[PDB]
């Protein structure tokens with residue numbers, strides 16, 4: 255259902271009424287928790 | 303009497319076990335139907351070393367086929383001599399082994415073991431006087447190396463008196479079927495040292511040369527190499543199955559061979575081997591055999607005995623022949639080439655003979671020799687292991703199965719003390 259009559263009247267349009275705003279560069283909520291372990295550091299030398 | 307029981311662990315073990323039973327079944331003249339259709343009474347005399355009577359005079363093998371990936375146990379069931387096995391003696395697993403020694407020895411092994419030991423005892427009691435077990439491994443994969451040695455480390459505590467062989471196929475230095483191959487080797491060697499009385503080492507490389515140089519074969523298929531392995535496995539028990547003017551049971555062949563309980567890595571060679579061209583130029587005499595077997599080419603393992611020093615040796619001849627000629631020949635070898643033999647062993651050969659040759663021949667022979675050049679093998683695998691193990695390459699696969707890192711060092715050092723026993727005993 256529409257709007258009642260006489261209420262679709264034109265309104266004033268300011269400058270930059272519809273302009274997106276970058277929130278900020280910020281650390282996200284969840285890093286998603288990598289499951290795979292890192293590569294060893296090429297100096298473990300377990301062999302004896 | 304002197305009953306054996308035969309294991310076949312892994313794809314290789316289940317593929318060369320096909321050929322082994324296609325050789326014996328022909329030797330005792332039993333059709334693929336199983337029924338016996340031979341000629342003499344010499345077949346039925348000592349058939350009970352390998353078979354069991356069944357109704358209507360049919361003999362089934364006392365073999366045990368264990369392998370993951372049932373995709374092989376349809377092949378043996380469809381091969382020509384496949385309808386002879388018992389359907390019970392087929393222990394498979396719908397899961398694969400992944401060429402991983404861990405899961406073959408830790409997870410997927412551990413549930414199949416008892417399901418195999420339930421089988422082995424069902425035919426460890428069928429024997430009158432059990433002689434001992436024998437296995438056909440392949441030290442590359444996971445079924446033959448994981449479930450293989452794990453089965454051994456169980457057989458050893460329930461039958462320590464008896465005698466178990468090992469026809470282990472080892473990895474190759476130049477040919478590399480897989481990448482992880484060094485790991486599956488060392489961790490398996492560390493099992494053979496303590497739970498194996500004898501262990502012949504075979505490599506596909508010497509199997510490829512003998513197939514190209516002597517046999518001059520154009521296309522060596524895998525079904526052709528196993529005609530060599532199955533030729534020597536049948537060549538051991540000729541004394542068990544047939545009369546002979548100097549018979550030698552399997553036990554007396556081990557004591558005369560391994561001086562100390564660890565140096566049980568042998569080296570084999572079959573004779574005679576000849577193309578279909580040189581069957582025109584060759585003479586069937588004993589000096590032909592003993593010349594070809596002592597050669598450094600019949601050594602089915604790719605180690606050169608001219609780098610080491612024979613501790614002991616052997617020879618199992620077949621065919622009505624002179625028992626002096628076979629003694630003076632082996633006597634000459636130790637005297638001419640007297641450097642490749644140790645000093646603290648005065649007479650380091652043993653010589654047997656059987657009156658019954660193979661089915662299609664008239665004279666044959668077979669060689670076993672416990673050299674010290676065998677340490678060249680264990681050096682090669684111990685360079686590639688310590689190469690990629692140093693950086694933990696491909697290690698997360700092994701440790702995911704509950705394994706740890708000490709399980710590697712132990713298995714590595716246990717190869718180092720072993721590679722020096724063969725060295726200190728080799729005083730040039």
Ligand SMILES: Nc1nc2c(ncn2[C@@H]2O[C@H](COP(=O)(O)OP(=O)(O)O)[C@@H](O)[C@H]2O)c(=O)[nH]1
Pocket residue numbers: 312313314315317318399401440442443444445446447471479480506524525527528
């Ligand atoms: N003489 C011979 N060697 C084989 C044969 N098939 C595989 N091998 C070797 O077996 C090695 C791997 O072991 P395999 O039995 O194939 O897999 P597994 O069941 O996990 O042990 C490879 O190096 C193959 O070359 C065969 O039919 N005859």
